[PDB]
Amino acid sequence: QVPDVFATFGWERRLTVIHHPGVMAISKLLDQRTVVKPRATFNQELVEEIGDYDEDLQRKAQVALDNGLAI
Amino acid sequence: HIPHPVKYVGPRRYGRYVYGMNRPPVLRQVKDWIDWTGWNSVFGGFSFQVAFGLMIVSGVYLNNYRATHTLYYTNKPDNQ
Numbered sequence: 001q002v003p004d005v006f007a008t009f010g011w012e013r014r015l016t017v018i019h020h021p022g023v024m025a026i027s028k029l030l031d032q033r034t035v036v037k038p039r040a041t042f043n044q045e046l047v048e049e050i051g052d053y054d055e056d057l058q059r060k061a062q063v064a065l066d067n068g069l070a071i
Numbered sequence: 072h073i074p075h076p077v078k079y080v081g082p083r084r085y086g087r088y089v090y091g092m093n094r095p096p097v098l099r100q101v102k103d104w105i106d107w108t109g110w111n112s113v114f115g116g117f118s119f120q121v122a123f124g125l126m127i128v129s130g131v132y133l134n135n136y137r138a139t140h141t142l143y144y145t146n147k148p149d150n151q
């Protein structure tokens with residue numbers, strides 16, 4: 001059984017709603033930017049477009065794409 | 072307004088600039104630029120001057136040349 005919780009947002013002007021305890025835990029976990037990290041996945045179409053702005057990144061991005069890495 | 076699609080049908084990317092190689096002709100590039108930024112501004116911006124210029128310069132023929140042969144009481148020379 002999962003209890004409902006109050007989730008509040010804002011510092012001086014605070015808005016309160018009801019929310020899921022697990023969903024709030026995930027939300028705060030994703031706010032730990034140093035721990036949980038976004039990672040990029042490429043496709044050949046977008047790797048080619050990168051070269052128009054950074055040639056070095058295109059070569060490195062190609063390596064990531066060839067190995068199917070989320071990096 | 073009425074939601075509509077982007078009307079630009081030209082090339083979305085020329086590729087990385089490499090000492091100006093493998094790029095379209097200059098006039099093609101100018102046309103693509105105006106296509107990309109909209110012809111409505113070009114027509115709107117130039118419309119006022121085109122209208123004023125056409126009207127003033129049209130007087131060269133409508134007000135000056137024609138008029139030289141407009142006065143019906145001028146072709147007649149005196150003592151002739």
Ligand SMILES: CCCCCCCCCCCCCCCCCC(=O)OC[C@H](COP(=O)([O-])OCC(O)COP(=O)([O-])OC[C@@H](COC(=O)CCCCCCCCCCCCCCCCC)OC(=O)CCCCCCCCCCCCCCCCC)OC(=O)CCCCCCCCCCCCCCCCC
Pocket residue numbers: 110111112113114115116118119120122123125126129132133
């Ligand atoms: C074999 C051939 C033989 C000969 C045959 C000759 C036949 C005749 C030939 C002549 C042609 C006839 C054509 C007839 C049919 C024309 C159909 C047509 O296409 O017309 C529409 C065409 C364009 O209209 P449109 O389709 O609505 O425009 C489309 C837009 O793209 C729509 O897009 P938009 O609306 O989004 O447009 C952009 C818009 C976007 O704007 C906005 O978003 C709205 C903004 C509104 C508020 C603005 C805020 C205030 C401004 C702030 C910025 C200020 C900057 C400047 C500051 C200046 C400081 C000093 O921006 C603007 O337009 C305004 C902002 C840009 C800057 C404004 C600058 C100031 C303007 C006001 C002053 C104008 C006067 C200046 C005078 C000089 C200086 C003192 O208009 C014309 O062509 C004009 C009329 C033509 C017919 C009358 C001609 C009469 C004279 C003919 C003589 C010809 C010669 C005869 C010789 C005879 C010998 C026998």
Ligand SMILES: CCCCCCCCCCCCCCCCCC(=O)OC[C@H](COP(=O)([O-])OCC[N+](C)(C)C)OC(=O)CCCCCCCCCCCCCCCCC
Pocket residue numbers: 081082083084085100101103104105107117
């Ligand atoms: C004589 C007295 C006056 C002298 C002073 C005149 C001052 C005005 C000069 C304006 C020059 C503006 C230069 C812009 C910078 C261009 C940079 C460049 O190299 O771009 C390359 C770029 C390369 O393209 P790109 O890589 O940006 O492409 C973008 C992406 N796609 C392909 C999707 C579109 O191409 C261009 O040159 C684009 C700009 C073209 C702009 C043309 C403007 C013309 C202005 C003069 C108007 C004349 C009107 C005459 C009467 C007409 C009557 C109807």
